[PDB]
């Protein structure tokens, strides 16, 4: 089972990127799909985007397109994403989650879409 | 060695490479090129009484 | 020196009667010194 630990909380002046990191335990990132969710406070939490495992590798929401970037790195096994040109509006939780890419026996396995497990948030900050 | 070197019917194995008859003598070969079995027979001979 | 053979056993005692003698698959040469052996297995990950 995979268990989940966050970055620390930031705050930035607009007009520059962040760095957000998710590191995992167990479960190595090439047998997992990870997908990042902002959660903004008083509305609920929407979707920035995350792995494809069929057509396509990884992919992003269409009103933040051009905008957020997403790593991954095998040897420290962690997943950073990074974007810039902070907004006012960016006040918000940004969270991390994770899923099994596959499922079965390697004769008969079936292709797995979801967000399963929850790591705990980073508050992104955007202020004067 | 000295023989005759004729077509055999022998099944031999695929690692195996030579023969020996009940006398423990070479009575088979597998040429290294091409991959048949030659038995070989000694050349005809016999005892001469006058 | 590796030796192997494959036959085929209708469901009954593992280790069965008569002779089956093994071919000679392979020889290795190595020149090491070797006391101790293992077995490798294939494990398959949960995913569930
Ligand atoms: C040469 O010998 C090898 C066996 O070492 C054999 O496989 C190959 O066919 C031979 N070459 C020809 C042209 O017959």
């Known amino acids: 089972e995979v268990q989940l630990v966050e970055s620390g909380a930031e705050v930035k002046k607009p007009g520059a990127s962040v760095k957000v990191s998710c590191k995992v335990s167990?479960?190595?990132?090439?047998?997992?799909?990870m997908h990042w969710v902002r959660q903004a406070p008083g509305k609920g939490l929407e979707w920035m985007g995350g792995?494809?495992?069929?057509?396509?590798?990884?992919m992003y929401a269409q009103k933040f397109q051009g905008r957020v970037t997403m790593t991954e790195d095998t040897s420290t096994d962690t997943a950073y994403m990074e974007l810039s040109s902070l907004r006012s509006e960016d006040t918000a939780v940004y969270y991390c989650?994770?899923?099994?890419?596959?499922?079965?026996?390697?004769?008969?396995?079936?292709?797995?879409?979801?967000?399963?497990?929850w790591g705990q948030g980073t508050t992104v900050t955007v202020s004067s | 060695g000295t023989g005759v070197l004729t077509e055999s019917n022998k099944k031999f194995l695929p690692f195996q490479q030579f023969g020996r008859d009940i006398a423990d003598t070479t009575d088979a070969v597998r040429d290294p090129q091409t991959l048949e079995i030659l038995d070989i027979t000694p050349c005809s001979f016999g005892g001469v009484s006058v | 020196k590796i030796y192997s053979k494959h036959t085929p056993i209708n469901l009954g005692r593992d280790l069965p009667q008569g002779f089956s003698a093994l071919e000679p698959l392979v020889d290795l040469p190595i020149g090491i010194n070797i006391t101790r052996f293992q077995t490798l297995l294939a494990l398959h990950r949960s995913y569930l």
């Open positions: 792995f494809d495992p069929e057509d396509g590798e990884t």
């Open positions: 167990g479960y190595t990132l090439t047998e997992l799909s």
């Open positions: 989650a994770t899923s099994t890419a596959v499922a079965g026996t390697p004769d008969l396995f079936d292709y797995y879409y979801g967000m399963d497990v």
